[PDB]
Amino acid sequence: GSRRYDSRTTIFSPEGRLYQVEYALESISHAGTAIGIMASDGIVLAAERKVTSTLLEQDTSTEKLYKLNDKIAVAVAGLTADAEILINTARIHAQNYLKTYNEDIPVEILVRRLSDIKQGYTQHGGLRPFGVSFIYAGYDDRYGYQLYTSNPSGNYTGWKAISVGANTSAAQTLLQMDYKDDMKVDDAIELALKTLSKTTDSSALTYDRLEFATIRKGANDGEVYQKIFKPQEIKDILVKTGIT
Amino acid sequence: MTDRYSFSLTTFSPSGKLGQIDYALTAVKQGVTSLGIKATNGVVIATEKKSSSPLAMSETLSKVSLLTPDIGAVYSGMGPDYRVLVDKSRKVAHTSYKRIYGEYPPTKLLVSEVAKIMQEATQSGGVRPFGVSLLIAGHDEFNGFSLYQVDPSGSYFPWKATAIGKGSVAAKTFLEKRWNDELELEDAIHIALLTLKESVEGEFNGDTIELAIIGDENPDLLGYTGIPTDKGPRFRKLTSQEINDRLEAL
Amino acid sequence: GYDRHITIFSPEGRLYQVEYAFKATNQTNINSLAVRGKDCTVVISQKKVPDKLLDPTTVSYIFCISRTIGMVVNGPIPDARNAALRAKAEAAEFRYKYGYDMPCDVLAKRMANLSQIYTQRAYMRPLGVILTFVSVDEELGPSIYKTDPAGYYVGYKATATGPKQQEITTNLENHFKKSKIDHINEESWEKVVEFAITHMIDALGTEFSKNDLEVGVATKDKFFTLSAENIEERLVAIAEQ
Amino acid sequence: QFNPYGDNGGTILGIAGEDFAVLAGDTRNITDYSINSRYEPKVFDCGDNIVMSANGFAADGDALVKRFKNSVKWYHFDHNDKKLSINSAARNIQHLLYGKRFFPYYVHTII
Amino acid sequence: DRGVSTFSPEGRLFQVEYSLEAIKLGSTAIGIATKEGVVLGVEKRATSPLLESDSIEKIVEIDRHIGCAMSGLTADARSMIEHARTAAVTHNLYYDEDINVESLTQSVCDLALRFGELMSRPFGVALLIAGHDADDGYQLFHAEPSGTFYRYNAKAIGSGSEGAQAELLNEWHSSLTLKEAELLVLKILKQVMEEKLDENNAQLSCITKQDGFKIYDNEKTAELIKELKEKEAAE
Amino acid sequence: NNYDGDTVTFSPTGRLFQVEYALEAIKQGSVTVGLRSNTHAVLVALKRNADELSSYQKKIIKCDEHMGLSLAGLAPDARVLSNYLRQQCNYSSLVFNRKLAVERAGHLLCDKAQKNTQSYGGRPYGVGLLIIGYDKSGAHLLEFQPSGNVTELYGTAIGARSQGAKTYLERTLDTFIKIDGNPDELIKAGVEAISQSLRDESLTVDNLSIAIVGKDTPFTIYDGEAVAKYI
Amino acid sequence: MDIILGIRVQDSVILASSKAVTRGISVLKDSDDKTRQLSPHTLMSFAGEAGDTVQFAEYIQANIQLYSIREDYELSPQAVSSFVRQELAKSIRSRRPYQVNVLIGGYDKKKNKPELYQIDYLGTKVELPYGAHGYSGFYTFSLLDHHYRPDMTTEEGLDLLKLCVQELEKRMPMDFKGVIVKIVDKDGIRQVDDF
Amino acid sequence: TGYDLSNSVFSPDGRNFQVEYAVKAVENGTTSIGIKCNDGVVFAVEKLITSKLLVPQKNVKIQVVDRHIGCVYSGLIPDGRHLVNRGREEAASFKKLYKTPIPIPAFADRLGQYVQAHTLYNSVRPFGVSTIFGGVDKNGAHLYMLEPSGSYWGYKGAATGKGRQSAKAELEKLVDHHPEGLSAREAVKQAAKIIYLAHEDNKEKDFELEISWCSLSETNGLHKFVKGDLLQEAIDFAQKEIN
Amino acid sequence: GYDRALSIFSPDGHIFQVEYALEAVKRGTCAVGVKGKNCVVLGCERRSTLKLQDTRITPSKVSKIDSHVVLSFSGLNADSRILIEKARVEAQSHRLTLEDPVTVEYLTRYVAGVQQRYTQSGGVRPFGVSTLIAGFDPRDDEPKLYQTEPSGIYSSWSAQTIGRNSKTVREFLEKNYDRKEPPATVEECVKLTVRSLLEVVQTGAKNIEITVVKPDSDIVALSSEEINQYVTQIEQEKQE
Fold first, then answer.
1. How distant is the alpha carbon of residue E227 from its chain centre?
2. Which of residues 110-129 of C touch B (CB under 8 A)?
3. Which of B191, C219, G137, I169 could form a disulfide with G132 if both were Cys (CB 3.0 to 4.6 A apart)?
4. Domain containing residue I206
5. How buried is residue A222: exposed, middle or buried, by Cβ count under 10 Å (0-12/13-18/19+)?
6. CA gap A14, A226 in Å, rounded
7. Are the C-beta atoms of residues A165 and A133 closer than 8 Å to each other?
């Protein structure tokens, strides 16, 4: 019968790893680097686009950074289309929680459910895993500012600063070197851009090859604001830290 | 009996590639050239109607398809795969949008739905990916004019102008030289016709070229009058005669 | 290569199972041809009954799909009958759901879609057949639309299918270069049939008795096949010429 | 409206002695004011020295007896030809009857 | 690979035969039937001395009149025991009587070939099912993952089984007392066990008509071990 | 070889190897014999034991008052198939008040086994059966094989070394076929037939199994002391 | 069932619930506690259809306790009351709805405020200074409209309650066998024993 | 390759090797035939006598469908039975909805479509029988033969199994020498002869002959087995001709 | 539904998918459980090629199943969440129907049953997880510690360890744990637990987690210093 053509996407190797998870991670390692840095007064998300053409429509574009709700955003490394499937799920999950409890969903709870969905594809159903790693940036009134990552294994962890995609090894070393606990958002912005600047596989880091977002306490008293940067705003903030 | 193929036929190789998606893209490479160009007041999508025998009537085979009155699509790769995607894309515009909001979806959201369908053929059990890339041009009230490319993976990108298939490397280079943010629709039609001559072997006239625009509302194409707010489809297929008129002043 | 057993892509982006289904198309070693009159659409196909034990009247590759649509198949008979039953059911359902007769081109598209599905979903094999649909459509007039195992389809001025299809094809293209029109400029379907048989004879370089052919004709509001007798009467008129 | 029940009359009676038991029933069968039969048995030998009557609506009575007789047959098949004791028959019959708790067999049963 | 329900060319089911190998790797279990009762004994085989051996449960009650010991992939046995217990209690509910030992065993064995492509593989555990009923008296059954069961006067299963069985072939006679059977099980267990048999690493149980199924405490088994060495010394 | 992975695959010579392998479990089975006169039909089966401490596996199963069978091969498969027969006999009784014709029993078994030889995932039955019964056209003997082939015979045998008994019955045909009105003489001939298939061993009291059905005799099974009469 | 009341004062919520359980012409029990603790700072009282009441209460309790363990955290009174409302709003369109009315009294530790929610079997939720289900409300609402003040102490709240229970024992046709009173505040939930 | 390991896979020539392997099982089976006659059809088959022990006359192989259709087949017998069971369900459902008994051409396509369906998927095996069947309907007599591929046609006469060639040659002579037609009683005799002739290619074990027929005049258009005087009369006419 | 028999027998009678699940356990961070006279302690290594971790929010390695029972594990982290959730649901369901919280044995038996089920159902692979489950039965003061593994076998342990280098630390506990005399206090029991982890771990920095469970739902996690005090103090007893 059909057994002949089944790759068996959910089995252990003799070493006890999950082939498809490992191979999905290998795929992700060639995607545009994305960085998240957490400050005491906000969070930065910065990410590098995949080798652009001059004709790409840069301002109506989105590939790396998506809004999950008003208090939570993600940066994507991996297959964009796989990521959109998970993002819509996550958006719906958030609204169900708000509908049930009349309260915005705590960041971890949203992160956990998405990670559980990923986990399921590694244990049953014989389908390939999602080729995606996320950096979650969000705020809630229990833990304040939070950063997490998840990858195709459905494993998630919390961070002060983290990268995913290409060159995370170099990026993690640079972040470790210059990160400090008492840091502010505007310092974190600079750290994120300088780190991408040094790990990038292109000759120089320009506005048109980036996506950028902040999550600040940055409006009127106690309430949180998400800013997905327009191209001109990235151009300015690139000059303002002297990379161009 | 019944489908016992409930496992994925696209999977990760040890190097991280998804073989079936790569191979689908290869089928797209062999496909006949198609392109799209975005002007300030319109979008043009074009391709070559490469006929299989001269006994075939190639007006009965439309490569450029209306999806909504303000959205059109063209492709490169496997024609039959494209035909069923058009059927599904048309339907999803209604089921997942018009039947809910009483209006046609904006371009990026319809593109989003098509991309979803193509992504699922990349992960669901017992199917292969679609062997096509799409270029979708459209207009909607709050985004204006837009042009998108959709690939076998389900990934899509917005373009100022681009091309796909056979001679796409050369055609993307040609368009880089000629595109600016001030192009008026008529200029973009002319550039489209020039770019397409590069990749076409045989006859190059209005019977071998298929070309449509997303431009001004066409009240004469509506079919009725008396609702002031209904002004007509912005999608218009250029006729054989209209294409030849533009080929002499070329 | 398991990419050669099921309908997944090969590294060069090809579907081998679809290509091999095209090769099964010629298993019967029959050629078929279709032309349009002013008023009619004629299809002819070779009829070969090797075994003397066969009841020759039951040997056919032409099908009445509806009152108005005929279909000729190139390919093995079990797949051909499968296609014919489905097309018959689809045409009947269309009439019931939508209140008018299914057009030839629409049935062609529908069957082409079903074939496309077999090229994408693994558990279904493609049918090893090519299907030529004919009618005199009430909107479009005389119509020929043809389907293959890739799920491709298109309308034709005229067409041919089978092992010696290229010979017949070029023969017909040469006529249409000369005539400068889209069809056989002829009033009666009897003469359009005579044209079809005549150009099959030149192109294949063989003569036919009354039992070597099989003929189907479409006019306004009916599609019908010819008896051995109506064909003989047609062969006789070509000879006296 | 369709009424799925009828009443076929008759009456039954069971008495136990020290080393025997009787189960008696009249043989008349009726609907309304008509006699259907003057001799239609409604007391049955079910095997393993068990007699059974299910009196009231005859169609239900016959169905029950048939199901119990069949139960005895499968008890042998499933438990190495063991004899079905009267206490075990009774408990089995309870489950046959209670399975139709919400659409009852309209009978009074005696074994 | 190859389907889970495939016959070998010798006409045996690959998966069943392979599960039989897994059972051979299992700890030893022995049962002996007498006219006074049936004894069931097992080798606990703790994988490490820190593991608290009384938590090793390889002898199990099914009903008052039916007991069970196991050998092989013992986690596979939980659902067979659960099914056994339900079949016994259910039979008592439907018929107001005790369920026959053979009937219980047949029911457990009905689960066995319910695998394929229903569970994904055969069970990798064999069972000794021991009990009393009024019709056939004291009985011992060996239930295999092939769905076959066999009545035995005595039987060993697990790693020391081919040795133990030859020993039981010699020692079993139709008139053994319960006490003789207890000692015999203890004796054959000490023979085939790796480690030195004591009351902590082996366990006894019996089922008698009068008191039903009982697992022996460690104090009680210790004495039967003491009584066994004294018997062996004294000739 | 490359064509024996499942039942859904023909070999290049048109064979079905998984069915052929199922047939092989029958050949390793303990021997059983069937034969009939015009008034009775008899089963004799040599039961096999595991060792000296074990029981001798039953090989004879009653299906109805007028029908039963003997098995050779996988016993659980005989239990499944016999249970199906019990149900079919039973359905004939409850619905039509009609004892199931031995011939229909045969057709029903053929069809049940056939399904498992044409679909993926299932396996063929690994057991052969001899079916006797007495119905409205007299005594019958049937041979079932898991290929689905069912055959009506005057006598036969299946299992290891069944070839001897089958030759014997082939010679004896004209004798036993007219042992009418005599139970113990049909049995003795059956016991004789089975003896032509013994080696290293002979028929004992916990080793022999006999069944008979006929004109005025319910299907009944004899084991233990009740077969001593026959050794 | 029958009598359940709630009053929210300055720094606590007080729930009073009758002790009688009646079937036909027999008071089967006179010490019934018509309440379940959902979390350490949230209490729910309930009345309505026999069987339904306790089954619903315990089902909610199980869900909130499960949430608590999973997140190692206590849901706010508002969040719990919304969860409960939704369960009842689903239920009312089921094959067999829960015929249960509830009061939820909780102390919100983030806000340092007591909160009282009244929810009927339809999933009709309202936050109130004081609440009642059943015929009780026809006496107690107007009484509390008169005597209630927003700034009262727990002790003033208990006196206000005594006034309610007195009126109900005077004018109500049934003998509801007194009330069990529970206080919910910053230190959790406790029961007054001599009322 | 390995194109032949799974049903429904096209080989590079465009063949389904599993069906062709099913044909081998058919060629390995006993001989069976049908002769179309004036107002009816006749079916016959060779039943190898494996042993003394087979009860003569009591292992019937020709099968009736509805009341007017006969089916015989060569190859795996159980597959043939399965196909006839399906044919019976198809005939019942046609009669239930349309009242008239199922026309033979109609019946032929029901079997055809069902057999063809077993070449569409790798989860089923093709049928290991070729089936000869037919009968009488409102348009006269019809004879059909149906292969493992689902291929079928109408036949003047037809044969399959080990002796298909000898039988085919014998059938061809009758078609040439009788262009006006063969009578039903005549066709029964010829059927016996051809089964005897075709038994040459299978002469290890001797055989039992079985015949059946439907004729508008001789059986009233119903399927009946030829037994008794008419069977022996035709056995004798066959005996006469091999000597 | 996807159906494949993924856990099947091999000719030698092994189920390779279950055995490879154990390899995943072996690769997981080490975990140990030690029971005292009146408490149980659970210790867990956390690997340290990860700095920039946020420790407030990363899932801790010991999970409360109910207020009186805890579970820790070695192996696939994502797999463990599924077992913990199921265990948590079962604990509340038990309280609902029996009106009593689960025994530690009962909860262990349930989790073990889940693990076993995944070794003989079509379409699923086994859990790449072994667990330690510890606590006190309701109204009981006798400490309880159980282990489960991918096969579904479970058992009680005086002390036990799982994960990478657990063979080294089982070695340690086997010579240092006296059945007759269990760590008669919290202090003693925590110490022995930290001593065993130091055989394998590195610096006792942000590398050792400890959780202490006492009777009647008394469960507390130590923070760095409280642990660090044990680290410092043992190292000073060592120079001898």
1. 24
2. 112-113, 115-117, 119-123
3. G137
4. 1-240
5. exposed
6. 46
7. yes
Cα–Cα distance measured from residue C212 to residue D13, given in angstroms and rounded to the nearest whole number: 88
Cβ-based contacts of H6 with chain A (< 8 Å): 1, 4
Q: Which CATH number belongs to the domain containing residue B128 in this structure?
A: 3.60.20.10
CB of F169 closer than 8 Å to CB of F19: no
B136 is in which domain, residue-wise? Answer: 1-250
Question: Domains in chain H: how many in total?
Answer: 1
Q: Does H58 touch chain F (CB under 8 A)?
A: yes
Whether chains E and D touch (3+ CB pairs under 8 A) is answered by: yes
Structural domain of residue H2, as residue ranges?
1-243
Does the beta-carbon distance from B27 to C9 stay under 8 Å? yes
- Alpha-carbon gap: H173 to the closest alpha carbon of chain F (Å): 31
- As for how many domains chain C has, the answer is 1
CATH number at residue I97: 3.60.20.10
Total structural domains within chain B = 1
Q: Are H170 and H194 in contact (CB under 8 A)?
A: yes
The amino acid sitting at I68 is H
> Is A75 in contact with A242 (CB distance < 8 Å)?
no
Q: Which of G64, G74, G82 to mutate to test the interface with A (most CBs of A within 10 A)?
A: G82
d(CA G82, CA B141): 39
Is F15 in the H-facing interface, judged by CB distances under 8 Å?
yes
- Whether I4 and chain B come into contact, CB under 8 Å, resolves to yes
Nearest chain A residue to H2 by CA distance is A4
Sign of CA dihedral C88, C94, C100, C102: negative
Contact H183, H171 (CB under 8 A): no
Q: What are the catalytic residues of H?
A: 30
Which residues of E, range 81-100, sit inside 8 Å of D by Cβ?
Answer: 94-97, 100
Q: How far apart are CA I127 and CA I152, in angstroms?
A: 10
| Rounded-to-integer distance, Cα A213 and Cα A211, Å | 7
Chains with 3 or more CB pairs under 8 A to chain E = A, D, F, I
Closest by CA position to A34, among listed A76, A5, A81: A76
User: If DSSP codes are grouped into helix, strand and coil, which group holds residue F123?
Assistant: coil
**What CATH number has the domain bearing residue A238?**
3.60.20.10
CB G136 within 8 A of CB G160: no
Experimental method: X-ray
Chain C residues whose CB is inside 8 A of the B28 CB are 13
Q: In sequence order, what are the beta bridge partners of F209?
A: F45
Pick the CATH number of G1-195 from 3.60.20.10, 3.40.50.1100, 3.30.980.10, 3.40.50.300: 3.60.20.10
**Count of domains in chain A?**
1
Arch. (CATH architecture) of E1-235 = 4-Layer Sandwich (3.60)
What CATH code is carried by the domain that includes residue C119?
A: 3.60.20.10
CA distance I95 to chain A (A): 24
CA C199 to chain CA centroid, Å, is 16
Identify the domain containing residue A87 by its residue range: 1-244
Of G59, G62, G72, the CB nearest to I64: G72
| E111 within 8 A of E80, measured Cβ to Cβ | yes
Resolution for the entry shown, Å: 2.4
Smallest Cβ distance to F154: which of H7, H55, H85? H55
Least Cα separation, residue H151 to chain B (angstroms): 20
For chain F, list the domains and their CATH numbers: 1-231 (3.60.20.10)
- For CA atoms B26, B27, B31, B35, the dihedral sign is negative
Taking an 8 Å cut-off on Cβ atoms, the answer to whether F76 and E154 are in contact is: no
Give residue limits of the domains in chain G: 1-195
Q: Quick one: tokens of C139?
A: 């909107």
State the helix-helix crossing angle for E178-192 and E161-171, rounded to 10 degrees: 150
The type of residue at B17 is K
Minimal-distance CA residue of chain F relative to H128: F14
Mutate to test the interface with D, among E89, E93, E96 (most CBs of D within 10 A): E96
